[PDB]
Amino acid sequence: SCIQFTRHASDVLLNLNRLRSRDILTDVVIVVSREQFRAHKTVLMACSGLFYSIFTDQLKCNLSVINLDPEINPEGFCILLDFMYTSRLNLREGNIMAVMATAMYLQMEHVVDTCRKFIKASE
Amino acid sequence: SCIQFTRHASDVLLNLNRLRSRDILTDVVIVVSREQFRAHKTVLMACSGLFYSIFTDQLKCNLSVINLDPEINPEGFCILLDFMYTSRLNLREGNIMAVMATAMYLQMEHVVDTCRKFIKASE
């Protein structure tokens, strides 16, 4: 018999992105080649099959630094991290290949789906 | 020029609630009289003006235990914590007064609004 506040989930995510922008309670740095990205482990796990696996691991759960595969593109990661915190994906002709490869590695199935559909439409 | 995934914010919140149920990466215990509630500080701040103030404080940000005012009803808190993690509010005749008082203390304006409207309709 619950009632539901439609905008609640979006409002929560907006405040989680505000915390990220202000670097409040971030508990991990994701290292992608020469670049570093601060984030909240809980948000990363909630969005990515890869981070969900990493941070449920009894040893990796306590690491403050995670190094991604050297093939991972920093811009692609940046675009996906922004998506995690906002629901918005900056998908462009010049970045689609890097975004799709990063989304496959991070196990973000909905992003992979759409990248596949956008590429198919251009061929 | 971003695209947006409609269900993303809800999917994130569902996974944050799964983390709470499994007690993964919870970093605070909220003590309400004889009862204890484990949660994630980031979610509490994202939902509540009171917790936002508490956890931006340079000393309170590092506490693992927060004791609420002894006037706070544990069931009312439980209902509001469930709401924070699900967008669903278990608002009933028998709990509405406690829920509204807890929501005022926690500074959860949308919940206070609806409690006010539901009480007004019964008078």
Partner: peptide, 4 residues
């Protein structure tokens, strides 16, 4: 607020 809605009836979900």
């Amino acid at each position: 607020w809605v009836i979900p």
